[PDB]
């Protein structure tokens, strides 16, 4: 019987499956157009 993965680690490993690559979608990144300042501190 193949047991399910669980971060709890009671029944199995903390580790994700070594094959299973849960790949997340990249965040919306803004390229800064002008050099500018907000000088403080």
């Amino acid at each position: 019987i193949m047991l399910p993965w669980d971060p709890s680690g009671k029944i199995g490993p903390k580790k994700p499956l070594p094959d299973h690559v849960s790949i997340v979608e990249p965040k919306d990144e803004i390229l800064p157009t002008t050099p500018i300042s907000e000088q403080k501190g």
């Binding site: 390229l31 800064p32 157009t33 002008t34 050099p35 500018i36 300042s37 907000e38 000088q39 403080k40 501190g41």
Partner: protein
């Protein structure tokens, strides 16, 4: 009314030159790393027979040599490696006196005080460690830190202004006050990651290069950006000459020394014999450092080769 020229070359590497470190006290002495684990300690004869001869070899790094730096005094040099740590090499006997262990991640920057007394070391873990010469981490910031990464930090040669600039892979040229020890200014506007930052001999303007392949000038008379001259190809290293009002810049295959009086490129000096002109990479320039007077420039390249570029006139 002057032009650079290849005075000589230091042929002594198997892998390519990750970083080369210079010192103003001894002009005929350069300490150069490679992809292999060594750091070759050259002796620059500059004679008819050979330009340089390997004097010592600072063997110690477990794996590939990332960064190496020499102090302004020149008898010692601290190097950093993928072990995480750095090693204070005694450059005469060519061996470590004191090893700086402490950094959690790759040490991408290290900086002496103007006194060459205090040491500060920056790594990709959101920390800035600060030490004395006796070698104790007096304080580091871990919880109170950046959301992103701090790839490099450097010092201002001017002693009266205790200021350090820091580039990174977040594309932000940060500026910190050593007195306040909190950032003076961030500078959003830069697309692409920054490689190197350097300050001018006068201490008025300072160049900055990065992924853009652009020499973005910040002002030291007033902490303000002024204007940018395009290095073009990835700027792997930059360095100001002390005697001249020059900006040396590693721009891809060749070196570029711009003038600030008239904002215009003068010339790019590429060797004609380029071998990889057939579905091959050309030799991209990775590092540079001016000599004490600024008449010789040591430049380390991706073709496992350190060319020196003397000013003729």
């Amino acid at each position: 009314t002057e032009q650079m020229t290849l005075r000589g070359t230091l042929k002594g590497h198997n892998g390519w030159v990750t970083q080369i470190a210079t010192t103003p006290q001894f002009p005929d002495m350069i300490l150069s790393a490679s992809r292999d684990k060594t750091i070759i300690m050259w002796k620059l004869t500059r004679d008819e027979t050979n330009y340089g001869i390997p004097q010592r070899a600072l063997r110690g790094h477990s794996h590939f040599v990332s960064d190496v730096v020499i102090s302004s005094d020149g008898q010692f040099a601290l190097s950093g490696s993928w072990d995480g740590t750095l090693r204070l090499w005694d450059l005469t006997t060519g061996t470590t006196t004191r090893r700086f262990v402490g950094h959690t991640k790759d040490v991408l920057s290290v900086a002496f005080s103007s006194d060459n007394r205090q040491i500060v070391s920056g790594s990709r873990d959101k920390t800035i460690k600060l030490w004395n010469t006796l070698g104790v981490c007096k304080y580091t910031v871990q919880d109170e830190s950046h959301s992103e990464w701090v790839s490099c930090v450097r010092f201002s040669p001017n002693s009266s202004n205790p200021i350090i600039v820091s580039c990174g892979w977040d594309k932000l040229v940060k500026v910190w006050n050593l007195a306040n020890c909190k950032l003076k200014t961030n500078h959003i506007g830069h697309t692409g990651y920054l490689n190197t930052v350097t300050v001018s001999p006068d201490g008025s303007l300072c160049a900055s290069g990065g992924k853009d392949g652009q020499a973005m000038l910040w002002d030291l008379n007033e902490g303000k950006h002024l204007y940018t001259l395009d290095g073009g190809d990835i700027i792997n290293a930059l360095c100001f000459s002390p005697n001249r009002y020059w900006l040396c810049a590693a721009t891809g295959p060749s070196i570029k020394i711009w003038d600030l009086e008239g904002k215009i490129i003068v010339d790019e000096l590429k060797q004609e014999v380029i071998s990889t002109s057939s579905k091959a990479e050309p030799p991209q320039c990775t590092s540079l450092a001016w000599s004490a007077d600024g008449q010789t420039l040591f430049a380390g390249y991706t073709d496992n080769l350190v060319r020196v570029w003397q000013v003729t006139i």
